[PDB]
CSV table of C-alpha atoms and ligand atoms in Angstrom, one decimal:
chain,number,residue,atom,x,y,z
A,1,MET,CA,85.5,110.0,99.0
A,2,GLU,CA,86.5,111.4,102.4
A,3,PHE,CA,90.2,112.4,102.6
A,4,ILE,CA,92.2,109.2,103.3
A,5,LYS,CA,94.7,109.7,106.1
A,6,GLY,CA,96.7,106.5,105.5
A,7,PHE,CA,99.9,104.7,106.3
A,8,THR,CA,101.3,101.5,104.7
A,9,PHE,CA,101.9,98.6,107.1
A,10,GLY,CA,103.3,95.1,106.9
A,11,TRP,CA,105.6,95.3,103.9
A,12,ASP,CA,108.4,93.6,105.9
A,13,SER,CA,106.1,90.9,107.2
A,14,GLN,CA,107.0,87.2,107.0
A,15,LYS,CA,104.9,84.2,108.0
A,16,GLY,CA,104.1,84.4,111.7
A,17,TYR,CA,104.9,88.2,112.1
A,18,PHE,CA,101.2,89.2,112.5
A,19,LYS,CA,100.7,86.7,115.3
A,20,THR,CA,103.0,88.7,117.6
A,21,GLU,CA,102.7,91.3,120.3
A,22,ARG,CA,105.4,93.2,118.5
A,23,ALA,CA,103.2,93.6,115.4
A,24,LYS,CA,100.2,94.9,117.3
A,25,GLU,CA,102.4,97.3,119.3
A,26,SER,CA,103.9,98.7,116.1
A,27,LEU,CA,100.4,99.2,114.6
A,28,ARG,CA,99.3,101.0,117.8
A,29,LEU,CA,102.3,103.3,117.6
A,30,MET,CA,101.6,104.0,113.9
A,31,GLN,CA,98.1,105.2,114.8
A,32,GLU,CA,99.3,107.1,117.9
A,33,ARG,CA,102.3,108.9,116.3
A,34,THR,CA,100.8,109.8,112.9
A,35,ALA,CA,97.0,110.1,113.5
A,36,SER,CA,96.4,107.9,110.5
A,37,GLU,CA,92.8,106.7,110.1
A,38,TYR,CA,93.6,104.1,107.4
A,39,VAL,CA,96.1,101.3,107.3
A,40,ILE,CA,97.2,100.0,103.9
A,41,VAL,CA,98.3,96.4,104.4
A,42,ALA,CA,100.8,95.8,101.7
A,43,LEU,CA,101.7,92.2,100.9
A,44,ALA,CA,103.8,90.5,98.2
A,45,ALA,CA,103.6,87.1,96.7
A,46,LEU,CA,106.6,85.8,94.8
A,47,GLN,CA,107.4,84.6,91.3
A,48,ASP,CA,110.7,83.4,90.1
A,49,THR,CA,111.5,86.1,87.5
A,50,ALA,CA,109.7,88.9,85.7
A,51,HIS,CA,108.9,86.4,82.9
A,52,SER,CA,107.7,83.4,84.9
A,53,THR,CA,104.0,82.6,85.3
A,54,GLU,CA,103.5,81.0,88.7
A,55,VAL,CA,102.6,83.3,91.7
A,56,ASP,CA,103.4,81.8,95.1
A,57,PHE,CA,101.4,83.2,98.1
A,58,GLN,CA,101.9,80.2,100.5
A,59,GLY,CA,105.6,80.1,101.5
A,60,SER,CA,107.5,81.6,104.4
A,61,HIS,CA,107.5,85.1,102.8
A,62,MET,CA,103.7,85.3,103.2
A,63,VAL,CA,101.6,85.7,106.4
A,64,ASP,CA,99.0,83.0,106.8
A,65,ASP,CA,95.4,83.7,106.2
A,66,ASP,CA,94.5,83.3,109.9
A,67,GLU,CA,97.1,85.8,111.1
A,68,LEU,CA,96.1,88.3,108.3
A,69,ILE,CA,92.5,88.1,109.5
A,70,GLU,CA,93.7,88.6,113.1
A,71,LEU,CA,95.7,91.7,112.2
A,72,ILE,CA,92.9,93.2,110.1
A,73,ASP,CA,90.4,92.6,112.9
A,74,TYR,CA,92.8,94.2,115.4
A,75,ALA,CA,93.3,97.2,113.2
A,76,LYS,CA,89.5,97.6,113.1
A,77,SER,CA,89.4,97.3,116.9
A,78,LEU,CA,91.7,100.4,117.0
A,79,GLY,CA,89.2,102.3,114.8
A,80,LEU,CA,91.3,102.0,111.6
A,81,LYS,CA,89.8,101.5,108.2
A,82,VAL,CA,91.8,98.9,106.2
A,83,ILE,CA,93.0,98.9,102.6
A,84,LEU,CA,94.3,95.5,101.4
A,85,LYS,CA,97.1,95.6,98.8
A,86,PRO,CA,98.3,92.2,97.6
A,87,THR,CA,101.1,92.6,95.0
A,88,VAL,CA,104.0,90.4,93.7
A,89,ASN,CA,107.8,90.5,93.8
A,90,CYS,CA,110.3,88.6,91.8
A,91,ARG,CA,112.8,86.2,93.6
A,92,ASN,CA,115.6,87.4,91.4
A,93,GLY,CA,115.0,91.0,92.5
A,94,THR,CA,113.5,92.4,89.3
A,95,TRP,CA,111.0,95.2,89.9
A,96,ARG,CA,107.4,94.0,89.1
A,97,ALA,CA,107.0,96.9,86.7
A,98,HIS,CA,109.1,94.8,84.3
A,99,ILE,CA,106.8,91.7,84.4
A,100,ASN,CA,106.2,91.1,80.7
A,101,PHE,CA,105.5,88.5,78.1
A,102,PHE,CA,105.5,88.2,74.3
A,103,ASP,CA,102.6,89.9,72.6
A,104,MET,CA,101.9,86.6,70.8
A,105,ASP,CA,101.6,83.1,72.3
A,106,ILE,CA,104.7,81.2,71.1
A,107,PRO,CA,104.9,77.4,71.6
A,108,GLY,CA,106.8,76.5,74.7
A,109,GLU,CA,107.0,80.2,75.8
A,110,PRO,CA,105.3,81.7,78.8
A,111,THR,CA,102.1,83.7,77.9
A,112,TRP,CA,100.1,86.6,79.3
A,113,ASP,CA,97.2,84.2,79.7
A,114,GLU,CA,99.2,81.9,82.0
A,115,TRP,CA,100.5,84.7,84.1
A,116,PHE,CA,97.1,86.3,84.5
A,117,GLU,CA,95.6,83.0,85.4
A,118,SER,CA,98.0,82.6,88.3
A,119,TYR,CA,97.7,86.3,89.3
A,120,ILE,CA,93.9,86.4,89.1
A,121,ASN,CA,93.7,83.3,91.3
A,122,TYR,CA,96.0,85.0,93.8
A,123,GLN,CA,93.9,88.2,93.8
A,124,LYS,CA,90.7,86.3,94.2
A,125,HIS,CA,92.0,84.5,97.3
A,126,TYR,CA,92.7,87.8,99.0
A,127,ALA,CA,89.6,89.4,97.7
A,128,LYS,CA,87.6,86.8,99.6
A,129,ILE,CA,89.6,87.8,102.7
A,130,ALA,CA,88.9,91.5,102.1
A,131,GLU,CA,85.2,90.6,101.9
A,132,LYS,CA,85.1,88.5,105.0
A,133,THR,CA,86.9,91.2,107.0
A,134,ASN,CA,85.0,94.1,105.5
A,135,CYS,CA,88.1,96.0,104.2
A,136,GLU,CA,87.2,99.4,102.9
A,137,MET,CA,89.3,99.1,99.7
A,138,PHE,CA,91.1,96.5,97.7
A,139,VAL,CA,94.1,97.3,95.4
A,140,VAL,CA,94.4,94.8,92.5
A,141,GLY,CA,97.8,95.7,91.2
A,142,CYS,CA,100.8,97.9,92.0
A,143,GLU,CA,103.2,99.5,89.5
A,144,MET,CA,102.7,96.9,86.8
A,145,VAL,CA,103.9,99.3,84.1
A,146,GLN,CA,104.6,96.8,81.3
A,147,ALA,CA,101.5,94.7,82.1
A,148,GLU,CA,99.2,97.7,82.0
A,149,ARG,CA,98.8,97.5,78.2
A,150,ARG,CA,96.8,94.3,78.6
A,151,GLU,CA,93.6,96.2,79.3
A,152,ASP,CA,91.4,93.2,78.3
A,153,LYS,CA,93.1,91.0,81.0
A,154,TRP,CA,92.9,93.7,83.6
A,155,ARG,CA,89.2,94.1,83.0
A,156,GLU,CA,88.8,90.3,83.4
A,157,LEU,CA,90.7,90.4,86.7
A,158,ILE,CA,88.6,93.3,88.0
A,159,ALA,CA,85.4,91.4,87.2
A,160,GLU,CA,86.7,88.4,89.0
A,161,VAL,CA,87.5,90.5,92.1
A,162,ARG,CA,84.1,92.0,91.9
A,163,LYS,CA,82.5,88.6,92.3
A,164,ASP,CA,84.3,88.0,95.6
A,165,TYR,CA,84.4,91.5,97.0
A,166,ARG,CA,81.8,94.3,97.2
A,167,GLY,CA,83.9,97.2,98.4
A,168,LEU,CA,86.0,99.8,96.6
A,169,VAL,CA,88.5,98.5,94.0
A,170,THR,CA,91.5,100.4,92.8
A,171,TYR,CA,94.7,99.9,90.9
A,172,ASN,CA,98.0,101.6,91.8
A,173,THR,CA,100.0,102.9,88.9
A,174,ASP,CA,103.6,104.0,89.0
A,175,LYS,CA,104.9,107.6,89.1
A,176,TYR,CA,104.3,109.4,85.8
A,177,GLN,CA,102.1,106.6,84.6
A,178,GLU,CA,98.6,107.9,85.6
A,179,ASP,CA,97.6,108.1,81.9
A,180,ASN,CA,99.1,104.8,80.9
A,181,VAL,CA,96.1,102.9,82.3
A,182,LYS,CA,93.1,102.6,80.0
A,183,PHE,CA,90.8,100.7,82.4
A,184,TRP,CA,90.1,103.4,85.0
A,185,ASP,CA,86.4,103.3,84.2
A,186,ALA,CA,86.3,99.7,85.5
A,187,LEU,CA,87.6,100.8,88.9
A,188,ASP,CA,86.2,102.9,91.8
A,189,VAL,CA,89.2,105.0,92.6
A,190,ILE,CA,92.3,106.1,90.6
A,191,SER,CA,95.6,105.8,92.5
A,192,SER,CA,99.3,106.2,91.9
A,193,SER,CA,102.7,106.0,93.6
A,194,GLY,CA,103.3,109.7,94.1
A,195,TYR,CA,107.1,109.6,94.4
A,196,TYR,CA,107.6,113.0,92.8
A,197,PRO,CA,110.7,115.2,93.3
A,198,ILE,CA,110.5,117.9,95.9
A,199,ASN,CA,111.0,120.6,93.3
A,200,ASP,CA,108.5,119.4,90.6
A,201,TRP,CA,105.1,119.1,92.3
A,202,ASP,CA,103.5,122.0,90.4
A,203,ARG,CA,104.2,120.4,87.0
A,204,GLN,CA,103.3,116.9,88.1
A,205,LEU,CA,100.1,117.8,89.9
A,206,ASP,CA,99.0,119.9,86.9
A,207,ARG,CA,99.7,116.9,84.6
A,208,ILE,CA,97.8,114.5,86.9
A,209,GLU,CA,94.8,116.8,87.4
A,210,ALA,CA,94.3,116.8,83.6
A,211,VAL,CA,94.2,113.0,83.6
A,212,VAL,CA,91.9,112.8,86.7
A,213,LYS,CA,89.4,115.2,85.2
A,214,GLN,CA,88.8,112.8,82.3
A,215,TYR,CA,87.1,110.4,84.7
A,216,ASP,CA,84.4,110.5,87.3
A,217,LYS,CA,86.5,108.8,90.1
A,218,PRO,CA,88.2,110.0,93.2
A,219,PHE,CA,92.0,110.0,93.3
A,220,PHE,CA,94.6,109.4,95.9
A,221,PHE,CA,98.3,108.7,96.3
A,222,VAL,CA,98.2,105.1,97.6
A,223,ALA,CA,101.9,105.2,98.0
A,224,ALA,CA,104.1,108.3,98.8
A,225,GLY,CA,107.0,109.0,101.1
A,226,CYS,CA,110.7,109.6,101.2
A,227,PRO,CA,113.7,107.9,102.8
A,228,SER,CA,115.8,109.9,105.3
A,229,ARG,CA,118.9,110.1,103.0
A,230,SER,CA,120.6,112.9,101.2
A,231,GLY,CA,119.4,113.2,97.7
A,232,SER,CA,116.2,111.2,98.4
A,233,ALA,CA,114.0,114.3,98.1
A,234,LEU,CA,114.8,114.4,94.4
A,235,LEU,CA,114.2,110.7,93.8
A,236,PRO,CA,112.1,109.5,96.7
A,237,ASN,CA,111.2,106.2,95.0
A,238,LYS,CA,114.8,104.8,95.1
A,239,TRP,CA,115.0,102.8,98.3
A,240,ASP,CA,118.6,102.0,97.5
A,241,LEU,CA,119.7,105.5,96.8
A,242,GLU,CA,123.4,106.1,97.6
A,243,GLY,CA,123.2,108.9,100.1
A,244,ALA,CA,124.2,109.7,103.7
A,245,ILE,CA,121.6,109.8,106.5
A,246,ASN,CA,119.5,113.0,106.5
A,247,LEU,CA,116.5,113.1,108.8
A,248,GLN,CA,115.7,116.7,107.9
A,249,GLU,CA,115.5,116.1,104.2
A,250,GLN,CA,112.7,113.6,104.8
A,251,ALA,CA,110.8,116.0,107.0
A,252,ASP,CA,111.3,118.8,104.4
A,253,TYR,CA,110.0,116.4,101.6
A,254,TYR,CA,106.8,115.8,103.6
A,255,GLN,CA,106.3,119.4,104.4
A,256,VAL,CA,106.5,120.4,100.7
A,257,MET,CA,104.4,117.5,99.6
A,258,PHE,CA,101.5,118.4,101.9
A,259,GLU,CA,101.8,122.1,101.1
A,260,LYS,CA,101.6,121.5,97.4
A,261,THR,CA,98.8,118.9,97.5
A,262,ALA,CA,96.7,120.7,100.1
A,263,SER,CA,95.5,123.2,97.4
A,264,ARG,CA,94.4,120.5,94.9
A,265,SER,CA,90.9,119.4,96.1
A,266,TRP,CA,91.1,116.3,93.9
A,267,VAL,CA,94.1,114.9,95.9
A,268,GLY,CA,92.0,112.6,98.0
A,269,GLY,CA,94.6,111.2,100.4
A,270,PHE,CA,97.8,109.3,101.0
A,271,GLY,CA,99.0,105.8,101.8
A,272,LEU,CA,102.4,106.8,103.3
A,273,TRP,CA,105.3,104.5,102.7
A,274,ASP,CA,105.9,102.8,105.0
A,275,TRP,CA,105.6,101.6,108.6
A,276,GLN,CA,107.5,98.4,109.6
A,277,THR,CA,105.7,95.4,111.2
A,278,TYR,CA,108.9,94.9,113.3
A,279,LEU,CA,109.6,98.5,114.2
A,280,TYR,CA,113.1,99.7,115.1
A,281,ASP,CA,113.8,101.0,118.6
A,282,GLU,CA,113.0,104.7,119.0
A,283,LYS,CA,116.6,105.0,120.2
A,284,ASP,CA,117.9,103.9,116.7
A,285,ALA,CA,115.7,106.4,114.8
A,286,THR,CA,118.4,109.0,114.3
A,287,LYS,CA,120.6,106.3,112.6
A,288,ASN,CA,117.8,104.9,110.3
A,289,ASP,CA,118.1,105.9,106.7
A,290,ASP,CA,114.9,104.2,105.4
A,291,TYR,CA,111.3,105.2,104.8
A,292,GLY,CA,110.1,104.9,108.3
A,293,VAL,CA,109.2,108.1,110.2
A,294,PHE,CA,109.0,106.7,113.7
A,295,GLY,CA,111.2,108.9,116.0
A,296,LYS,CA,112.1,111.2,113.1
A,297,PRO,CA,111.2,114.9,112.5
A,298,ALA,CA,108.9,113.8,109.7
A,299,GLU,CA,106.6,112.1,112.2
A,300,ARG,CA,105.5,115.4,113.6
A,301,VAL,CA,104.9,116.9,110.2
A,302,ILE,CA,102.6,114.0,109.2
A,303,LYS,CA,100.7,114.0,112.5
A,304,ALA,CA,100.1,117.7,112.3
A,305,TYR,CA,98.9,117.5,108.7
A,306,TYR,CA,96.6,114.5,109.3
A,307,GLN,CA,95.1,116.2,112.4
A,308,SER,CA,94.4,119.3,110.3
A,309,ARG,CA,92.4,117.4,107.7
B,401,LIG,O1,113.8,94.6,103.2
B,401,LIG,C1,114.3,93.4,102.7
B,401,LIG,C2,113.7,93.0,101.4
B,401,LIG,O2,113.7,94.2,100.5
B,401,LIG,C3,113.2,93.8,99.1
B,401,LIG,O3,113.2,95.0,98.4
B,401,LIG,C4,112.3,96.0,98.7
B,401,LIG,C5,112.8,97.3,99.2
B,401,LIG,O4,113.6,97.1,100.4
B,401,LIG,C6,111.7,98.3,99.4
B,401,LIG,O5,111.0,97.9,100.5
B,401,LIG,C7,110.8,98.5,98.2
B,401,LIG,O6,109.8,99.3,98.4
B,401,LIG,C8,109.1,99.9,97.2
B,401,LIG,C9,108.0,99.0,96.8
B,401,LIG,O7,108.5,97.8,96.1
B,401,LIG,C10,106.9,99.7,96.0
B,401,LIG,O8,107.6,100.0,94.7
B,401,LIG,C11,106.5,100.9,96.7
B,401,LIG,O9,105.5,101.7,96.0
B,401,LIG,O10,107.7,101.8,96.9
B,401,LIG,C12,108.6,101.2,97.8
B,401,LIG,C13,109.6,102.2,98.1
B,401,LIG,O11,110.4,102.4,97.0
B,401,LIG,O12,110.3,97.1,97.9
B,401,LIG,C14,111.3,96.2,97.5
B,401,LIG,C15,110.7,94.9,97.2
B,401,LIG,O13,109.8,95.1,96.1
B,401,LIG,C16,114.2,92.8,98.5
B,401,LIG,O14,115.5,93.4,98.4
B,401,LIG,C17,114.3,91.6,99.4
B,401,LIG,O15,115.3,90.7,98.8
B,401,LIG,C18,114.6,91.9,100.8
B,401,LIG,O16,114.6,90.8,102.0
């Protein structure tokens, strides 16, 4: 596995966004400003709650198949490789890591089998798209901490994705959960959300290295990044962190992350979080306290690092 110089795109997208000039201009700027060679197209279906079993990928929250194919083809026309990452959010705001059901099937209660049926059929739909567009990698789940114990069901899902899609298949675990997953052998690549504190990379990388050396798979941080807010460098996963704007903290987070990971040969790349489909005006960058790096000092740190690899 060559080093993946990646950036996540499309998380803010709604139906119709990918049809637009604005979306293509944003993706061109992502490539120009960061020297990324991969785009991670991150999409989210919706379910009602963390304990409901129907996964909706057809409403206004979800780009249509035709515009998704258009955007992937356009990314390829720019020379980008594409990683497709379809995940799921809850309408009531609960983090998908809490999606969970009773260990036993109780009459009248939602079951693991019902949820996985809906989720597998969701993934198979997008696996067919990844196959038709020749996406380089497909990510079958993201941060599903409580669902990860259902190893049998995850193995079933991966086999179903394999029937539709012949590329690389991975699963994206949450921070600190790299060893919670017991089905890495069924995947091609190990990946995690590397939202680790700026002052704890040495301990965390040593921990992950010991996990990764138990398998014969490449590894990368399919999500990583930091909002431009004070205190975010300590908890970079908290998108709602109460903190004043701080562009330099985000740049410093990135500088430390690349420095610490550059010396671990097994860190095989990054899918940096994240680049908006509808990008803010460069004039508004110094007021933006979110994950974007457009117009911020972190943009130069990323581009320099990606150009060096
Ligand atoms: O932006 C409006 C939209 O935001 C939803 O909530 C978001 C967050 O705003 C943020 O994008 C967050 O990103 C997580 C992501 O879920 C995943 O964990 C990734 O690895 O890390 C990023 C950064 O922490 O995602 C949630 C949605 O899951 C929500 O508030 C909507 O109501 C709303 O319109």
